[PDB]
Write a protein that binds this DNA or RNA. Sequence first.
DNA 1: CCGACGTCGCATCAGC
DNA 2: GCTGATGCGA
DNA 3: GTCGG
Length: 326
Amino acid sequence: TLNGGITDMLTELANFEKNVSQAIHKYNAYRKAASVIAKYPHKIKSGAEAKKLPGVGTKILEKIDEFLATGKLRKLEKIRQDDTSSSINFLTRVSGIGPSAARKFVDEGIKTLEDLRKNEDKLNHHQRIGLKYFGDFEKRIPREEMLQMQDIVLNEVKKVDSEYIATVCGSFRRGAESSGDMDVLLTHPSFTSESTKQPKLLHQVVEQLQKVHFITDTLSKGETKFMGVCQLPSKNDEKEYPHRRIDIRLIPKDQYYCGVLYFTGSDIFNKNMRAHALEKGFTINEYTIRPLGVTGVAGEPLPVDSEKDIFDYIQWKYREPKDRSE
DNA sequence: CCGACGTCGCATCAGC
DNA sequence: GCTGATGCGA
DNA sequence: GTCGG
Ligand SMILES: Nc1ccn([C@H]2C[C@H](O)[C@H](COP(=O)(O)OP(=O)(O)C(Cl)(Cl)P(=O)(O)O)O2)c(=O)n1
Ligand SMILES: Nc1ccn([C@H]2C[C@H](O)[C@@H](COP(=O)(O)O)O2)c(=O)n1
Ligand SMILES: [Cl-]
Ligand SMILES: [Mg+2]
Ligand SMILES: [Mg+2]
Ligand code: NA
Ligand code: NA
Ligand code: NA
């Protein structure tokens, strides 16, 4: 990409602040700057030119000038040399190992893939499955494979109850030619904002996907959110497909548009859009958009009959899913 | 300057 | 057990 | 780290 060197540098800084410094707001600010630069349609010539973009301030502009002049960033060259930072950044690549667990593991002398495998009993269930599929989860999913996965999920869900509707969201819905995982929004008319007329609505879909050996492992599961592992079937004598991460979110059927807005993302697009709502005097979540009173307290949900109604309230022109890849 | 920064589900743990 | 952080994830 | 009042 046009400014890939700069955006990679800012992404590495963001990951450092999240994993090592445990500074969540610095992480978000580095990712916001990388995102705005990533869609900037010129090859950046200077820090000053980048500082014109919202989210790029004085410090990033200085780093951009250093990187443009030398091709590298001294602050990052030193981070890469630091063993504790190196170890923490590696351990946090395992699903279920976050910043705190990674620092505790290094304290205990658990620093490598070899160390993790030797100490499975030090791992909670989520972490244990993240270690099991460590290599698989860093592989990307071709859209063609997403389409086969979509076919299985939709057809199995229809076999449980033809009134379910499953919608694949995430980067797939944004039209990406590959995805990092599969995100499935699920609705059923028995589950609305007003009542749950049927129990186990998420459970029985998960069970059916387990029965046909599509879902293979469970990271976490509740009444409305499943987080797990799935795998396409392979043909005779074929090498197996990698195992893939799958998230399934059951959303009240009447709140589908807020739900599909949220689950289509991207994550930065959601942050930007929800920050804009706040400035406009609204709060948006995966269920509702509600006004803010003078006291900063959310009011009653506003009527929503399309994704576009949500954009309208906050005075944004509508953006198709393919233009939300921030 | 400096307060705010998106919002929430599930797993885990501490205190009662 | 309940409740309210806190961790990690979407 | 950046922004807006
Ligand atoms: N911090 C987050 C993370 C995710 N999300 C939402 C938006 C996003 O699209 C998400 C699905 O999570 P994801 O991590 O799978 O994000 P994707 O957009 O699908 C993706 Cl580009 Cl990271 P990938 O999964 O295709 O690699 O749910 C969010 O709102 N806030
Ligand atoms: N998972 C889904 C997807 C769509 N829908 C509903 C919302 C609208 O009434 C209708 C529109 O479908 P679509 O947005 O796919 O054009 O389907 C649902 O209830 N659950
Ligand atoms: Cl709500
Ligand atoms: Mg995804
Ligand atoms: Mg602000
Ligand atoms: Na700027
Ligand atoms: Na992790
Ligand atoms: Na996901």
